[PDB]
Amino acid sequence: NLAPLPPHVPEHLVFDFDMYNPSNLSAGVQEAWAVLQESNVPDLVWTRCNGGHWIATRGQLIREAYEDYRHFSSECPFIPREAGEAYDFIPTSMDPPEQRQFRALANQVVGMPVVDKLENRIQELACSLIESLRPQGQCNFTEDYAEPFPIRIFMLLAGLPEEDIPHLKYLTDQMTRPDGSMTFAEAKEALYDYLIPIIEQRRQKPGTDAISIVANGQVNGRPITSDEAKRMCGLLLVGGLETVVNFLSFSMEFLAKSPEHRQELIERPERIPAACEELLRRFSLVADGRILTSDYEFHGVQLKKGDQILLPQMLSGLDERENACPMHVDFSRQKVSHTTFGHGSHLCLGQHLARREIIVTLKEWLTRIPDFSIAPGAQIQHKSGIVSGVQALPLVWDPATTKAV
Numbered sequence: 001n002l003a004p005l006p007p008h009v010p011e012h013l014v015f016d017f018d019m020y021n022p023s024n025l026s027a028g029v030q031e032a033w034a035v036l037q038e039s040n041v042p043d044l045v046w047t048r049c050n051g052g053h054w055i056a057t058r059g060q061l062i063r064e065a066y067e068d069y070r071h072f073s074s075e076c077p078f079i080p081r082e083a084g085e086a087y088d089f090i091p092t093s094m095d096p097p098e099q100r101q102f103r104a105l106a107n108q109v110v111g112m113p114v115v116d117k118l119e120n121r122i123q124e125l126a127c128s129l130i131e132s133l134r135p136q137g138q139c140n141f142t143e144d145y146a147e148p149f150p151i152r153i154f155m156l157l158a159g160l161p162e163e164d165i166p167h168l169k170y171l172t173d174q175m176t177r178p179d180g181s182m183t184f185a186e187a188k189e190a191l192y193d194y195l196i197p198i199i200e201q202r203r204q205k206p207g208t209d210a211i212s213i214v215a216n217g218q219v220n221g222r223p224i225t226s227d228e229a230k231r232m233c234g235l236l237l238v239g240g241l242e243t244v245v246n247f248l249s250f251s252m253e254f255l256a257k258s259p260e261h262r263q264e265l266i267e268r269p270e271r272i273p274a275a276c277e278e279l280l281r282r283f284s285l286v287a288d289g290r291i292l293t294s295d296y297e298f299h300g301v302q303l304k305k306g307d308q309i310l311l312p313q314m315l316s317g318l319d320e321r322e323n324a325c326p327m328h329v330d331f332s333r334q335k336v337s338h339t340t341f342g343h344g345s346h347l348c349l350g351q352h353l354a355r356r357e358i359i360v361t362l363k364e365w366l367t368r369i370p371d372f373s374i375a376p377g378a379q380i381q382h383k384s385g386i387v388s389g390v391q392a393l394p395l396v397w398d399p400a401t402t403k404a405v
C-alpha cells in the first residue's frame with residue numbers, strides 16, 4: 001500500500017511507481033520503468049510506494065546526484081529504508097573520503113590486470129558450456145548458461161565450492177528481488193554467517209583466492225579488519241551472482257527476437273564490442289539510490305534531510321535526451337551514453353570482468369549457434385528490483401545450422 005504523503009511534498013509531484021512491481025512489467029521491465037519518462041511526468045517525482053521516496057527520472061539529474069556525495073550520501077543506498085539502513089557493504093555504504101581506500105583493495109581481485117589473468121579460463125568455460133548445449137537444439141538459457149557461466153567463474157576466483165551456489169543464489173536473490181521469504185537484513189545476516197568462518201580460515205592460512213586477498217589485504221597502509229573484509233566480500237558475492245547473470249538473459253532474449261541484429265553480428269563480428277555497449281545501455285538493469293544529508297533545493301524541488309532518492313542507473317541511457325530513439329537498438333550508435341555501471345566515485349569495479357564475460361559469450365555463442373529463437377508459444381516474463389531480471393528464457397535452434405569449432 002501507500003505511505004501517507006509527507007507535509008513537504010507537493011501533490012503535483014506524486015507519481016506512485018513501485019520499483020519492485022511496476023505497473024507495465026508485462027511489456028518489459030525497461031519499458032515499465034520508462035513510463036517515468038513520458039511527457040506528463042516531471043524530472044523529479046515522489047512515490048508513496050515502499051515507504052515513500054523520491055525518484056529522479058532523467059539522466060541529467062541522476063548524474064548530478066551521483067556526483068554530489070556531500071548532499072546525496074551512500075550511507076543508505078537501498079529502498080525500502082529498512083534495507084538501506086541494514087546495508088553496510090564496502091565500499092558502497094561509504095562516502096568519500098573514507099570510501100576510496102577500499103576501492104584499491106577490491107581492484108586487486110576484479111581489476112583489469114586480474115581480468116587479463118582469467119582471460120583464457122573465461123574463454124574455456126564459455127566454449128565448454130556452449131558446445132555442451134549445441135547439439136540439443138534447445139536450452140533454458142537462464143539455468144543452462146546465464147547462471148553457470150558467470151557464477152562458476154566467480155566461485156573459482158573466490159575459491160568457493162560450486163555446490164554452495166543454490167544457497168548463495170537464494171540469498172542474493174532476496175537482497176535484490178525479494179519474494180518475501182526473507183527481509184534484506186535477514187539475507188544479509190545469512191550471507192555474513194556463510195562468510196565469517198571462511199574469512200577466519202583464510203586469514204590464518206592465506207591463499208591466492210579473492211577472499212584470501214581481501215582478508216589479508218591492506219587499506220592505505222594499515223591491515224583490513226575481519227569485519228571490513230566480510231563487508232567487502234559480501235558485496236563481491238552479490239556482484240558475482242546477480243549482475244552479469246541477469247544481464248546476459250536480457251541480451252540473449254533480444255538477439256533471439258531480432259534475427260536482423262543477430263545476422264549483423266554474425267556477418268560483422270568485429271562490431272561485438274560496440275554491440276555489448278549498446279546492449280548495456282538498452283538493457284540496463286540496476287536501480288539504487290542515496291539519502292539526503294541536509295535539506296536541499298534540487299532542480300526546484302525541496303528535498304528534506306533523511307529523504308531517500310532512487311537514482312535509477314537504468315534510466316540515464318533510456319532517456320531520449322541522451323540518446324535519440326532510445327528504445328531502438330543500433331549497434332552503430334555514434335555516442336552511446338549511459339550510466340549502466342554507475343556514476344561518480346562509486347563506478348562499478350567489476351565492469352571490466354563484466355564486459356569480458358558479455359563479449360566472450362556473444363562471440364562464442366554466435367560462432368557455434370548463429371541461428372536461434374524463443375521457443376514457440378513462450379511468453380518471457382521480467383522481474384523488477386534493485387537488479388532487474390528475466391524469469392526464464394527457453395531457446396530453440398536447428399542443430400543442423402550449428403558449428404563445432
Ligand code: HEM
Nearest residue numbers: 091092236239240243244247286341342346348349350354
Ligand atoms: C552487468 C554487470 C554489472 C553492472 C550493471 C553493475 C552495476 C554497478 C553499479 C550501478 C554500481 C554503482 C552502485 C552505486 O553507486 O550505488 C556498481 C558498483 C560496484 N560493482 Fe558492479 N555491476 C556489474 C558487475 C559487477 C561485478 C561482476 C562485480 C564483481 C565483484 C562488481 C563489483 C562492484 C563493486 C565492488 C562495486 C562498488 C564500487 C564502490 O562502491 O566503490 N560489479 N556496479
Ligand SMILES: CC1(C)[C@H]2CC(=O)[C@]1(C)C[C@H]2O
Nearest residue numbers: 092238239243286288386387
Ligand atoms: C547495486 C549493486 C548491483 C552493485 C552495488 C550493490 O550493492 C549491488 C546490488 C551489487 C553491485 O554490483
Ligand SMILES: [K+]
Nearest residue numbers: 075084085087
Ligand atoms: K546503512
